[PDB]
């Protein structure tokens, strides 16, 4: 009903919110990791499309 939502909002207001600097730092770190993995995967796929198309004939 509504008691669950009230308890959840109370727990949320009891929690502490992170600042701007720590959030920016963690976002930059996770973005660096994500972009690294994505660039590696994209380069691997782009270099294996033509090689595969040549190999399998």
């Amino acid at each position: 009903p509504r008691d669950f939502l009230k308890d959840g909002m109370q727990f949320i207001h009891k929690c502490q919110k992170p600042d701007r600097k720590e959030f920016k730092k963690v976002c930059q770190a996770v973005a660096i990791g994500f972009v690294a993995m994505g660039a590696i995967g994209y380069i691997v796929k782009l270099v294996h499309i033509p090689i595969n198309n040549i190999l399998v004939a």
């Binding site: 499309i49 033509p50 090689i51």
Partner: protein, 470 residues
């Protein structure tokens, strides 16, 4: 199941967008106080040029070729662009899959993935293995560890330190036997017996050009010898800078060892190397215009105790006639500058140092107890002024090491806690350090050492009694 583009209208757009997204960023990304001194030592050009050469960074050749080739391919692709019911295709040239170049590109990719990857991986592996934590080569630290003795202080520390590895790369080639005889004769002759007794034998015993040259040069530097060769000073003032880092490494090693005398010895040799004084000589040579003659004339003809800076400055106006007499000793215009620069050195005089556990009255055994030591910087996140020693290329921020050991056994109690800042010509300060109390019960007796590098003669040794009960 793909249909490549052979007429050339789709791969240029893709390659242009990609290389542009790369090159735009690659191009946009590649487009504290000092103490007052009115004295300049001899050979100023050499030391200043060495100081300027110490630091150097271009960071331009790494990105220039990338940016220019990116802009070249951008121009080529935009030129090719300006020149000119369900199927999927790829925006890639047709010649890549043509039967002519197929085996060629296959072998190219095979060779690349088989050679460039393992080679660069092994290069990075063997490139990040030789350097240790203290910015010294693993061979140097390994060679210096075996040279550790039980109780060596003063003299033998220089011998155990002159077995580094940077001297190999510094004077490699015919640079070893250039002025070996000259430097060795000068060092072994001009220095008296009170500055080297058996180190002469230890120097003569070794048979190796590089190490013997390194040791002779280090002694010539640490004794302010001023050899006449205009080419050897440029390497002497560099051997000093190398010896400083080797001293850091040797301090780390001696701290790893559980002994007390090598600790004080390494700290004293770091105090001496950062300056130009000799280990065991009068610490009065920290002043700018002082020479062996005047320090021999101020502290007596032949004395076993060396007048420190405090006891020298605390004398009445008799030094005015005893030091700067005029016949070749000094001049008033120089003595005034010497005093005006001596009245600005950091001396730490502690006043209260008591144990205190966080949130309790009496220290309970096996508890995390911290000591507060509050002194006051009185000359005889705030940064202190840099070192005053003008006889080394780099500028050293004066640090402080605080540790404490016991007396019943000649061994250290807790590891030291190094810091370099205060909380700001004097005002009260505060310094903290936390460690673990002993497990059992019974009051102990400790002594803390305020040993500080970058200067010689500023040491505070007080005894503190620990309390513990339940």
């Amino acid at each position: 199941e793909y249909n490549y583009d052979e007429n050339g209208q789709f791969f240029p757009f893709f390659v242009l967008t990609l290389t542009g997204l790369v090159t735009l960023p690659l191009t946009y990304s590649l487009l504290a106080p000092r103490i007052k001194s009115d004295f300049k030592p001899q050979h100023d050009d050499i030391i200043q040029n060495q100081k300027r050469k110490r630091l150097r960074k271009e960071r331009r050749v790494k990105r220039a070729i990338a940016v220019v080739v990116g802009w070249a391919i951008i121009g080529y692709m935009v030129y090719l662009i300006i020149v000119t019911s369900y199927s999927i295709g790829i925006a890639l040239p047709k010649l890549i899959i043509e039967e002519g170049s197929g085996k060629y590109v296959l072998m190219l990719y095979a060779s690349l993935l088989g050679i460039l990857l393992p080679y660069i991986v092994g290069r990075w592996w063997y490139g990040s293995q030789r350097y240790t934590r203290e910015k010294v080569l693993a061979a140097s630290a390994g060679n210096m560890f075996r040279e550790y003795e039980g109780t060596m202080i003063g003299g033998p520390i220089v011998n155990a330190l002159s077995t580094g590895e940077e001297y190999k790369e510094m004077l490699s080639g015919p640079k070893a036997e250039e002025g070996l005889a000259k430097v060795e004769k000068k060092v072994l002759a001009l220095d008296e017996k009170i500055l080297s007794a058996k180190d002469r034998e230890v120097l003569r015993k070794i048979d190796n050009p590089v190490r013997r040259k390194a040791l002779a040069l280090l002694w010539a530097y640490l004794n302010r010898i001023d050899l006449e060769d205009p080419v050897l000073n440029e390497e002497k003032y560099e051997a000093g800078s190398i010896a400083l880092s080797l001293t850091e490494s040797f301090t780390a090693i001696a701290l790893a060892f559980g002994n007390l005398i090598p600790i004080i010895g390494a700290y004293r040799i770091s105090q001496c190397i950062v300056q130009a004084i000799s280990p065991g000589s009068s610490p009065l040579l920290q002043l700018p215009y002082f020479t062996p003659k005047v320090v021999e004339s101020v502290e007596g003809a032949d004395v076993k105790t060396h007048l420190s800076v405090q006891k020298y400055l605390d004398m009445p106006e008799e030094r005015r006639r005893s030091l700067t007499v005029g016949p070749g000793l000094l001049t008033e215009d120089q003595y005034n500058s010497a005093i005006a620069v001596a009245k600005q050195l950091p001396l730490f005089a502690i006043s209260k140092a008591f144990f205190k556990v966080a949130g309790e009255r009496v220290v309970t055994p096996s508890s995390l107890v911290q000591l507060v030591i509050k002194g006051r910087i009185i000359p005889p996140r705030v940064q202190p002024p840099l070192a005053h020693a003008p006889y080394l290329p780099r500028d050293h921020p004066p640090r402080w090491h605080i540790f404490l050991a016991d007396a019943k056994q000649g061994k250290i109690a807790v590891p030291p806690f190094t810091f370099t800042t205060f909380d700001k010509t004097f005002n009260m300060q505060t310094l903290r350090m936390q460690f673990q109390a002993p497990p059992q019960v019974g009051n102990f007796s400790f002594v803390l050492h305020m040993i500080s590098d970058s200067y010689m003669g500023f040491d505070v040794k007080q005894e503190i009694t620990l309390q513990v009960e339940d």
